[PDB]
Design a protein around this ligand. Structure first.
Ligand SMILES: [Mg+2]
Ligand SMILES: [Mg+2]
Ligand SMILES: [Mg+2]
Ligand SMILES: [Mg+2]
Ligand SMILES: [Mg+2]
Ligand SMILES: [Mg+2]
Ligand SMILES: [Mg+2]
Ligand SMILES: [Mg+2]
Ligand SMILES: [Mg+2]
Ligand SMILES: [Mg+2]
Ligand SMILES: [Mg+2]
Ligand SMILES: [Mg+2]
Ligand SMILES: [Mg+2]
Ligand SMILES: [Mg+2]
Ligand SMILES: [Mg+2]
Ligand SMILES: [Mg+2]
Ligand SMILES: [Mg+2]
Ligand SMILES: [Mg+2]
Ligand SMILES: [Mg+2]
Ligand SMILES: [Mg+2]
Ligand SMILES: [Mg+2]
Ligand SMILES: [Mg+2]
Ligand SMILES: [Mg+2]
Ligand SMILES: [Mg+2]
Ligand SMILES: [Mg+2]
Ligand SMILES: [Mg+2]
Ligand SMILES: [Mg+2]
Ligand SMILES: [Mg+2]
Ligand SMILES: [Mg+2]
Ligand SMILES: [Mg+2]
Ligand SMILES: [Mg+2]
Ligand SMILES: [Mg+2]
Ligand SMILES: [Mg+2]
Ligand SMILES: [Mg+2]
Ligand SMILES: [Mg+2]
Ligand SMILES: [Mg+2]
Ligand SMILES: [Mg+2]
Ligand SMILES: [Mg+2]
Ligand SMILES: [Mg+2]
Ligand SMILES: [Mg+2]
Ligand SMILES: [Mg+2]
Ligand SMILES: [Mg+2]
Ligand SMILES: [Mg+2]
Ligand SMILES: [Mg+2]
Ligand SMILES: [Mg+2]
Ligand SMILES: [Zn+2]
Lengths: 208, 104, 124, 138, 83
RNA sequence: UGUGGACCCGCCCCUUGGGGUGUGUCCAAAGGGCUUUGCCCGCUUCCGGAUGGGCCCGCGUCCCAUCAGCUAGUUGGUGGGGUAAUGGCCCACCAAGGCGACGACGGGUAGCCGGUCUGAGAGGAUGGCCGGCCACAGGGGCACUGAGACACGGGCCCCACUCCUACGGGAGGCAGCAGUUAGGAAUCUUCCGCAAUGGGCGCAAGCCUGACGGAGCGACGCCGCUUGGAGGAAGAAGCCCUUCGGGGUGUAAACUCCUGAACCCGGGACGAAACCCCCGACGAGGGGACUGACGGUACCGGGGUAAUAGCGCCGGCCAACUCCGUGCCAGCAGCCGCGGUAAUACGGAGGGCGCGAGCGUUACCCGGAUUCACUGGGCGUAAAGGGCGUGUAGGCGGCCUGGGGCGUCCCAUGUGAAAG
């Protein structure tokens, strides 16, 4: 996807499991289980009081690495949510969470966002039954995100919606496991998102 | 509308023309306090009717010369050389401010 | 001061003095070395600092500093300068850009290469 | 000769309260009077009165403070914590009805003279007038 | 004279004209006297021509000359329909 | 010929030279084409409109007072000249005026604006794309033609420069599109097309259009996009630490499977329907024909390859520490400061942090800076009270009543183009 590179070293640096790869991050094999310290030479040395500044940085990265967005892409989203009418912390999440790449992830078409970013740039995904090959396309509510008629059975998407039989999908999305349809019902509310991140801190960082 | 200003004749020294002094209060842009400020208009008096110290309304009008683009409309208040003397001392002081000084 | 005072005089806007008369405003200016010298630093620092009296296209004879491990400048080297105090050498206010014109990129550098202007070393 | 008599009164008051007097005389004028009327309505002063200190007319203003407090320094809380002249001579300050101050989010007044009389910030807002912002009190 | 004509207002490969009344001597995209309609020749949205036949007719009544397409567009939004 | 219009005088209303009116005088015209008595295109005069302009005025518009006095067409008057029209615009005669500390005069700098950047705001900075106005066309003057010019690709003259020259005499003017050269840190193709939009002439057919629509070049900017995705060890090798037990790079790699930028193949646009022609009347309305530079591009479909990663930073401010090397040297450095033999500050390495087709540097503007303070500062000792008075202008001004309504406040209304 974007970023590109060792990912679990990030899981490790933020000290929280971030689940940047679907399967395996549920196995006893994500490094955070039985290797949960920061990466590199000084991983296991004790820490120092991270500055006020330091805290806000990581808290941002934690969010921003969770979605695999860049930062000029991320900053723009936050800047817009800032100007936007309403509470800027929660709204920001809603904008992040409205990205097609992540909506595809949420509907369990892909096992993770990195993989979901592929499924999109490769046009396996329809929005309102018309191919959208843009991972950062904004899904408004009402829109219907499907798997593309002539994609509808690769070894990957078959096996991937196979697991989606009997799993629950977020309150703000309805999914159809059969026709591989799925809907964006409402901009997710802050509470809906169980994000391992204090989005407030993030706002402090950008107002330095 | 042709602008009408009201002021005080401080000159008879020309033929068919009087000099009117027109003040204007207004609050200052930055600092807010209300400042005076005033400008002399050469006004057209064809009858040599108005005299030194008359208070006159003046009216925007078609050019009569360089400098002259106002004609004297009505008489407002008759004689009062207080405003004139005021204006007269103002100009007299200029005698002092230069390179020299003494008894003006 | 009184409001009336601020009415009579006013406040007085300030004025910026350029820490670098590289004229034209310009971000860089070309010149020719007329002296490659060495200078003793100050206050609590001793060493031998590389410097070059440079005659600028801006009609200015200014002394510019020569960053890097070592240089190759001679008393007729055409050189491009760029502004920057050398804290120690007082009266040295611009740097020579390294890797432009006669001055050559610092050899065998691996770290901060864009400053010092030395190409990415090859590998296969 | 007092240069600004509205301010001398706003002050006389401020000085009195700060040492917890009972009351205080300010020389009389309809305008000063017109103001104190408001201070009373909004409860910053118990009242005013037209006493007469030796031949010439004053306004006895009676002050109102808090209750006694516990701790080192019992001195009660002022009811008039703050009272300042906004428009002064040689810098007059007029506001239109659109830009009348919201004083302390309204836990305090601003007193302005208008062509409809001496009114508070909320009084002029209803009546729909601006005027000459005289002082804030809060 | 004074013209009814099109002024260019879209972007590269994305043209939208404004049907405007202007002295014929302005640059085509310069200060005009009055806009009286618009025109998307690509028919990208269902509303791709709009006029206001009253002003359209007003101007005509004082001999603004339409161009060979302004007249064309005008016609189509029934400016000249007299029945 | 006089519909009418101009002018002198008189009367009427109006009120500056507006509108009527009566004598007197004065002023018109152009022809062409036809599917030829009947229309099409022109012409003349007058009134009205639309658009576009001239001129005049109130207010606003940077720095220097180490520029304090300035002016003789100067300031006004009468008469004339001139103009489309006011006017010392110009001229003759007369009067002695006009401007200045509210900054005249001079000097410096500068196209102005809508806007742009910044700022919580008030402010500060700017006027680059785009749009409006202005001014200019090698430098300086000048008029002619005309509805309009004192005229970029019109004329005249003087000047400087280049080129032709038979020695007398001529020819030029890219601040139009490209392009060359010079200067500079630095700034593009001597491209395609009139298909669209717009302009000039033409009854039209059409012609002209370096306006314009496009393409080209440059990471210069913004946005979008890729360099893969899922699995994958108690965890290769190399490189680096180490208390010699180990720890790190690291699920990273390999490898398994999956998708399929690039690339190939086929379909292939939108922008264009008017002018024209036919029916109807040359009108309304209906019918038909022509036309695409961009471009076989965009978009669609079939096929299909695991496929570029840099750059800066890691003493504090400030996110990120370890070894070696060097020895007040070599060097770093935005400010504080590092280096004098155990350097997390220099150089390399491993590792880490931050951004990522970019990352840094330099330059400049606003910010933080309430650090010119209106909002929003100070002056006993930090910088700052004049050596003291007298007093000019100016600023400020006790209590009561009444008039006006200049400031101030309120309502309605016009204006505040587009773009932003
Ligand atoms: Mg360095
Ligand atoms: Mg007649
Ligand atoms: Mg008359
Ligand atoms: Mg008449
Ligand atoms: Mg007659
Ligand atoms: Mg005749
Ligand atoms: Mg004929
Ligand atoms: Mg007109
Ligand atoms: Mg004379
Ligand atoms: Mg005359
Ligand atoms: Mg004199
Ligand atoms: Mg200039
Ligand atoms: Mg500020
Ligand atoms: Mg411009
Ligand atoms: Mg030239
Ligand atoms: Mg030319
Ligand atoms: Mg030529
Ligand atoms: Mg050069
Ligand atoms: Mg054309
Ligand atoms: Mg055309
Ligand atoms: Mg992988
Ligand atoms: Mg395959
Ligand atoms: Mg496929
Ligand atoms: Mg044609
Ligand atoms: Mg017919
Ligand atoms: Mg038709
Ligand atoms: Mg690979
Ligand atoms: Mg740190
Ligand atoms: Mg050495
Ligand atoms: Mg700097
Ligand atoms: Mg060492
Ligand atoms: Mg040591
Ligand atoms: Mg180090
Ligand atoms: Mg450092
Ligand atoms: Mg400031
Ligand atoms: Mg201070
Ligand atoms: Mg002192
Ligand atoms: Mg003293
Ligand atoms: Mg002293
Ligand atoms: Mg006095
Ligand atoms: Mg008073
Ligand atoms: Mg007074
Ligand atoms: Mg009264
Ligand atoms: Mg009033
Ligand atoms: Mg606008
Ligand atoms: Zn993980």
């Amino acid at each position: 996807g974007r970023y590109i590179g060792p990912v679990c070293r990030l899981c490790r640096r933020e000290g929280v499991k971030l689940y940047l790869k679907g399967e395996r991050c549920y196995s006893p094999k994500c490094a955070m289980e039985r290797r949960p310290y920061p990466p590199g030479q000084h991983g296991q040395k004790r820490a120092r009081r991270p500055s006020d500044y330091a805290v806000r940085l990581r808290e941002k990265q934690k969010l921003r690495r969770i979605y695999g967005i860049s930062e000029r892409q991320f900053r723009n989203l936050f800047e817009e949510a800032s100007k936007k009418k309403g509470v800027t912390g929660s709204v920001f999440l809603g904008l992040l969470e409205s990205r097609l790449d992540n909506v595809v992830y949420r509907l369990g078409f892909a096992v993770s966002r990195r993989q979901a970013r592929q499924l999109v740039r490769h046009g396996h995904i329809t929005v309102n039954g018309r191919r959208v090959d843009l991972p950062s396309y904004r899904v408004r509510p009402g829109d219907e995100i499907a798997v593309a008629e002539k994609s509808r059975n690769l070894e990957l998407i078959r096996q991937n919606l196979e697991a989606m039989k009997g799993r629950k999908v977020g309150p703000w999305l309805s999914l159809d496991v059969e026709g591989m349809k799925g809907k964006f019902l409402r901009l997710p509310d802050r509470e809906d998102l169980a994000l391992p991140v204090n989005e407030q801190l993030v706002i402090e960082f950008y107002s330095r | 509308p042709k602008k009408v200003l009201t002021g005080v004749v401080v000159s008879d020294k020309m033929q068919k023309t009087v000099t009117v002094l027109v003040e204007r209060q207004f609050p200052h842009p930055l600092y807010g306090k209300v400042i005076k400020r005033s400008k002399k208009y050469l006004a057209h008096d064809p009858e040599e009717k108005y005299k030194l110290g008359d208070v006159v309304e003046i009216i925007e009008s078609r050019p009569i010369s360089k400098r002259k683009r106002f004609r004297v409309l009505r008489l407002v208040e008759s004689g009062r050389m207080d405003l004139v003397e005021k204006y007269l001392i103002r100009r007299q002081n200029y005698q002092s401010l230069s390179k020299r000084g003494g008894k003006a | 001061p009184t409001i009336n005072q601020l009415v009579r005089k006013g406040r007085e806007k300030v004025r910026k003095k350029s820490k670098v008369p590289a004229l034209k405003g310009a971000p860089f200016r070309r010149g020719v070395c007329t002296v490659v010298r060495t200078v003793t630093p100050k206050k609590p620092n001793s060493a031998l600092r590389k410097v070059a009296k440079v005659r600028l296209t801006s009609g200015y004879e200014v002394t510019a500093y020569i960053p890097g491990e070592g240089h190759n400048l001679q008393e007729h080297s055409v050189v491009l300068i760029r502004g920057g105090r050398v804290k120690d050498l007082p009266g040295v206010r611009y740097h020579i850009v390294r890797g432009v014109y006669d001055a050559a990129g610092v050899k065998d550098r691996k770290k901060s290469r864009s400053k010092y202007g030395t190409k990415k070393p090859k590998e296969a | 000769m007092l240069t600004d008599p509205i301010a001398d009164m706003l002050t006389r008051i401020r000085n009195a309260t700060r040492v917890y007097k009972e009351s205080t005389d300010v020389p009389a004028s309809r305008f000063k009077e017109e103001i104190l009327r408001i201070l009373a309505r909004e409860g910053f002063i118990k009242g005013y009165e037209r006493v007469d200190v030796d031949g010439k007319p004053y306004l006895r203003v009676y002050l109102k403070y808090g209750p006694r407090r516990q701790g080192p320094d019992p001195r009660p809380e002022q009811v008039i914590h703050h009272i300042r002249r906004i428009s002064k001579p040689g810098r007059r300050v007029y506001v239109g009805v659109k830009e009348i101050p919201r004083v302390r989010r309204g836990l305090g007044i601003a007193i302005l003279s208008t062509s409809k009389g001496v009114l508070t910030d909320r009084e002029a807002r209803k009546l729909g007038v601006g005027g000459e912002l005289i002082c804030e009190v809060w | 004279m004074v013209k009814i004509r099109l002024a260019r207002f879209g972007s590269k490969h994305n043209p939208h004209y404004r049907i405007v009344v202007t002295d014929a001597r302005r640059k085509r995209d310069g200060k005009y006297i009055e806009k009286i309609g618009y025109y998307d020749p690509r028919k990208t949205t269902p509303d791709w021509l709009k006029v206001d036949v009253e002003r359209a007719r007003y101007w005509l009544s004082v001999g603004a000359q339409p161009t060979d397409t302004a007249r064309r567009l005008l016609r189509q939004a029934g400016v000249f329909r007299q029945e």
